[PDB]
Amino acid sequence: QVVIKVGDAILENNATVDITAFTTEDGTEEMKFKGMVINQSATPINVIGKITKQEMIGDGHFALCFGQCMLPNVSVSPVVEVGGEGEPLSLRYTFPVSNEGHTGAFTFSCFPESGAPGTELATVNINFKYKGGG
């Protein structure tokens, strides 16, 4: 009943989304994933969003926004009450400009307020493929 949407599409659970676009500012690159977490039930549900896996180049950092934009490298959102219109979700990955490519890789899951292991309601895997991905 809880899904992640990217662009116009509901993702299958555990989908993988590749982001290749980057913007440059002050010798630092930024790549961004954007989507929505949607609760398709008539009854609202309280969830927490977590980055459950993170793979970055050495001086990379990430920034999660879900309910609130969290500080750099903070992996857990606040509790958010989600319904049918959905809650925006974004993940920004920032890292040094390089002539060489690499892939930053993250997993985001939505959990019931509990946060109990194995209770994931929806999961997306996000690959930031910078300059070919390496």
Residue numbers in the entry: 28 to 161
Copy the relevant paper text.
PorA is 246 amino acids in length and is composed of an N-terminal domain and CTD with an N-terminal signal sequence consisting of 27 residues. We found in this study that PorA impacts the PorXY-SigP signaling pathway that regulates expression of the T9SS in P. gingivalis.
Initially, we tried to determine the structure of the 23-kDa CTD-containing PorA, but no crystal was obtained. Thus, we purified and crystallized the trypsin-resistant fragment, termed PorA-N. The structure of PorA-N was determined at 1.3 Å resolution. The structure of PorA-N adopts an immunoglobulin-like fold composed of 10 β-strands.
